[PDB]
Amino acid sequence: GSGKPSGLRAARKLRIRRRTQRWADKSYKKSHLGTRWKSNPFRGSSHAKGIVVEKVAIEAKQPNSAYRKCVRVQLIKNGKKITAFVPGDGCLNFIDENDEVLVSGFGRSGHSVGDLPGVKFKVVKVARVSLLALFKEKKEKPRS
Amino acid sequence: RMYGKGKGISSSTLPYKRKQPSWLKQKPSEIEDAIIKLAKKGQTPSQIGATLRDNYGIPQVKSVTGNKILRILRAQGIATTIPEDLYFLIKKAVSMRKHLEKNKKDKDCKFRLILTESKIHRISRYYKRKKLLPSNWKYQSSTASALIA
Amino acid sequence: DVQHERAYQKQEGASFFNSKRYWKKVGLGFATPKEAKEGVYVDKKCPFTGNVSIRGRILKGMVISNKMKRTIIIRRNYLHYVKKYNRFEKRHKNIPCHCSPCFDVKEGDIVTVGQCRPLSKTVRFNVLHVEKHQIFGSARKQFVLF
Amino acid sequence: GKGIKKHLKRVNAPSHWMLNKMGGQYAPKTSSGPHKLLESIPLVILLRNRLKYALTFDEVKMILIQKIVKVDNKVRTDCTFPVGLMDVIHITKSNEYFRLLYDIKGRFVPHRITNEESKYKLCKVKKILLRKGRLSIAVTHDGRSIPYIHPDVKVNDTVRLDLETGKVLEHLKFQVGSLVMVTAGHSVGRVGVISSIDKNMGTYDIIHVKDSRNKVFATRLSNVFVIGDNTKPYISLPREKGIKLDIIEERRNRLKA
Amino acid sequence: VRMSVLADCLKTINNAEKRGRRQVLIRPSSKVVIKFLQYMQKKGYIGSFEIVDDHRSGKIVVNLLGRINKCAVISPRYDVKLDEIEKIITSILPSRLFGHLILTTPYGIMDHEEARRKHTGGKVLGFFF
Amino acid sequence: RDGRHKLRLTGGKKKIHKKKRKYELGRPPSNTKLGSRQVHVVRGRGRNYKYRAIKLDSGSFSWPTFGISKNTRIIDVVYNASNNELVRTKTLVKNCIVVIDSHPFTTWYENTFGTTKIGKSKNIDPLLLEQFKQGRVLACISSRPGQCGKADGYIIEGDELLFYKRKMDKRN
RNA sequence: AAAAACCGUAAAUCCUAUCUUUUAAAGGAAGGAGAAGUCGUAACAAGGUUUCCGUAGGUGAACCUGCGGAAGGAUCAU
RNA sequence: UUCAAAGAAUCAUUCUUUUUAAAAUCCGGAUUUGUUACUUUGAGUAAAUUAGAGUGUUCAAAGCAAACAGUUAAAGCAUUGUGUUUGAAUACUAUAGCAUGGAAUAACAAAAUUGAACAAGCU
RNA sequence: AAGGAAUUAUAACAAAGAAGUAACACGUAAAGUGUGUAUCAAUCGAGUUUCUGACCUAUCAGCUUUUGAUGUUAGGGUAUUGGCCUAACAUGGCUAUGACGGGUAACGGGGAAUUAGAGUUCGAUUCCGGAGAGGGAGCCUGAGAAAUAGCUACCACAUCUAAGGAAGGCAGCAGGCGCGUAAAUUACCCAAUUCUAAAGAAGAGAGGUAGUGACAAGAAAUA
Ligand SMILES: [Mg+2]
Ligand SMILES: [Mg+2]
Ligand SMILES: [Mg+2]
Ligand SMILES: [Mg+2]
Ligand SMILES: [Mg+2]
Ligand SMILES: [Mg+2]
Ligand SMILES: [Mg+2]
Ligand SMILES: [Mg+2]
Ligand SMILES: [Mg+2]
Ligand SMILES: [Mg+2]
Ligand SMILES: [Mg+2]
């Protein structure tokens, strides 16, 4: 025996079991449940624009020892408060305490990244100038 | 086995030669008559066959007479309305029910009663599908007892 | 009793007074039964006796019901292939058909029905030929590939 | 609001027009007329894409304005008038006579033709009505009504029909061995003899048509156009003579040149 | 219980081959099974076999040439169109150069190559290497 | 209005996704009555006019036995297998049994042969004869006056006539 | 022609009812993270009462105890 | 539940021809015989896309065009005049529906407290 | 005389009976044309309609039926069939092969991406079909509209007004605000492709041509 039915006229069972079971696949569930749109700040989007509310430090996971510089921002789209880690060696000060930040994902869909506890977002533009550009500095300077 | 975990293979297995053996003297008519007599005397098909095998010298009514014994009974018109095996099952069920009525706490009996009921329903269904039973025939736990006769 | 309605059930296409009862052939080799040619009964939507011409599809079914007046239900049972599993699966569909009392049809009887115009909200078919057949469970449950 | 559609999109145009995808957004949309748009061809296409007398629609229109192009001998100034399967075109200035035929592909060619043969046209009857005064009228694929047609004419057969005058010459029954052309699917150009007709009860009457390479092909009776008796066709067929070669054979032929 | 006699028979045969038997008692003979065996014989994989007639479902005993690598049924006897064959054979049998994929076809049972030659595909019984 | 907006046979609500397309036209019933003639024209589809008779009287009535017809005032409606309301309101429809001023037929008969082309040999019913004696005879309508705009009908005969009489039956 | 009456389409507004969907809330009670914080030592060794199950009661907390199970026991063994 | 058998070609195998029962049909000869699944052929489908044929868009993505002969004519074919060959294939267009060859595999239908086939007789 | 099948074509008889058959305009062709007109057929179609075919959900299992749910009869209505609507009479119909609900960040399909082969996802978006013109509803005209650069009304927005009234509907093209992670010029033209017309000769933000354009795609310097 196989486990599955392998009848010629078996197709109904075969389809139906697969349909029920698909939902055990985590990835599939993430894709096809409706709670995606509800319970997500970006609301199914690449980036989002948020004004900043608080420049804040976040202490890293136990083995590593740093205070990672985050920015607690409010999405204009959604009215959602989220921490977004700011890259760069000294790029917290490149932003203002109230600046229209454009924030992206961190690289792992929702799932959090690296040393950081539960900051799923990467600010990547401030006052329309590119954070990366500012970091490089040879390219650009923050307009205000 | 349909219901237990029994897996035994005890069986009659008939001989290769199916044209009757030389030593069999009985002409077919006589054997038919004998069969009829047996039927009249209250015996059921299987029992009749057994009797034929033992008391008279004859292995298989199929080799002496082209027909099997149930068929010949039918031809003669002394066939039961209610088939052998099914009837037996019904009887058993009835017996079980009486016991249950008497003796309410018997769980094993009840379980076995259910099994026999199920088997009846299978057998019953099969007979309906042919034409030995009428389609208007459910088996009822209330009636059952009267049915067997 | 033939005249059961508030109106007189006549038979259009009869021609009572002059000339040398009315039925037609319906075609596709479906023999008009004795009960249509003989045997008075008026039906506007009999294929043979009435004024509906059968044309379009012909599909065999198996009757599930006689409960409606001069009207029958037939489940077609068939096999929907699903290419993913390269397997089939029993599927079905209940076509309501008009009967006409030429055919005495108990349930489980095989019928063949021609199309015809829309006779009612759902009955687009009428039964042309009724094979007998016998059934033991419920017609509901009999699969007969067809 | 929603009624009929006046435009035709150039990709939705029927392939045997052989239009471009580029070179326009739209197509000409045959006027209503004596032919079914999917098996017709407007005059514009003939003038512009087939004969190439015109470069543009404008030029075609201009040409039409001079009352010089006749289709079945009476003039037409409607650029998008549908010409269709068998019809003789008489471009008056060149003194050219064309007859539309099919290629061995689906495509219309204008065939080129003599004065003498031009004066008739084949026409397949479709329906044969009875009308008032028990007079029978045939109805041809040319969307033309022939009245007082000879009684022996039956529903599928062709009729050699004169153009100078509306009356008929002769008719060719739909027989078991009658020279036939096709006018629809796959085997469209094909010309054969007929082996057999099926005559299905409720359905389309399928027929089988042996070629002159003895390659049998089937076809609906619908879209078959009787063209002769077993011996000779009653029209001049194109160069190929309705002998749809195999692909390989065609390629070989192409190579040998 | 039994369902597909043929499958069981083939399994038995395979087992015998694996052990390196010589003889092997295929226990319910079937017309289809017989046909299959004949086909196998034709393409060399099997020797003689003495379909013994009881007065029931017969027994075959079959003579093996130590030559089969595997033989098998492919249950669900999938209908298989002539165009659909090639992919199936690619999926199944070890090389295009050898092995045989046996179809029941309205022109009796025959291998994939045979089917191709004919024109008709049909339902797919089994195979060997 | 000729359209969907209706349950699905399984008894599921067809969620409507389409207005009302004019070709699903359900223009309202002409309850055509007795009276002096009066008919309007309603403009159906391709300028296909149809004649909403709204009052009527002088329909063409046939006599099937002899296969002839005559135009008569119709003096009353007496049965309607649809509903009794219609008959109360004296409304003519395509299977109303009504009473014809039936002198014309009698006159015709007199002209032709006797007193109460020619395949005569049938020579009348008893019931029908009796009816004629009072002047006024029962007759179906057969046109659909609301469409056609004429109260054309025919005289009710033998078996059907008897049935209608029975239906009418008075009694209590 | 206006105006009117009656059916019939029937917008819209209001009133409920129900449902769906976001959303507030004193308090409650979980969870996860963090910080070398308090109290024990439960588990891992016969883990110092073998462990674990189901169930019932208990107890600051791990847990304890009863009943019947299991070896995933520390016994394949008289 | 009709298994099989025999002959000819080819490099043990491949493809072909012929017959071995019973019933109805046709002038001793010759020719129809369950249903559906399945399969094979078709038929009928818009093109665009896709696969794919042809075609040096300078290549290529393309497109559906083109090629050929000439400092200006020969050659052809037409009865001084007229360029010529052509191409824009084919396949894909379900899982259903349509017709279709079918021997295998599947179903189902036919089939005995009795079922129908003939020859005679009577209505 | 067909069609597999006729209450079909058709023919006769008895009754009604629309509309029509040029009170029109050119000067043409080798006597012709334009415009109009009854019926028929063709055609451009349209409406209905048969069968088969769809995603997620059973933490949706019973639904539908006074309010037509299922059928029969008679009608009314329709261009025609039909609970499409009315009346009268049945008590049906669908459902574990998932009815009925719910969800869809769903218009459908041709297709797109990605795949050895299966498949999985996508398909607002060049074509076909459906639907809608702020929201519903209602009409007139007409062959065709339940039309929206037609009209009536209400709701929701909103413009001018001398305050009496009046008009208005970009999901046409540009263009603007808003929303937003997120998207171009208030350009030139009817030359091509087509449509409409009293039909070469006029119109067409249909359509095309440029402008913006690192959406993609191809070729290709920096020796
Ligand atoms: Mg069991
Ligand atoms: Mg056993
Ligand atoms: Mg609209
Ligand atoms: Mg201890
Ligand atoms: Mg411890
Ligand atoms: Mg311990
Ligand atoms: Mg205690
Ligand atoms: Mg304690
Ligand atoms: Mg009612
Ligand atoms: Mg949507
Ligand atoms: Mg789309």
Ligand SMILES: [Mg+2]
């Ligand atoms: Mg959307």
Ligand SMILES: [Mg+2]
């Ligand atoms: Mg808007």
Ligand SMILES: [Mg+2]
């Ligand atoms: Mg509107």
Ligand SMILES: [Mg+2]
């Ligand atoms: Mg607008």
Ligand SMILES: [Mg+2]
């Ligand atoms: Mg509005």
Ligand SMILES: [Mg+2]
């Ligand atoms: Mg715009």
Ligand SMILES: [Mg+2]
């Ligand atoms: Mg962009």
Ligand SMILES: [Mg+2]
């Ligand atoms: Mg132009």
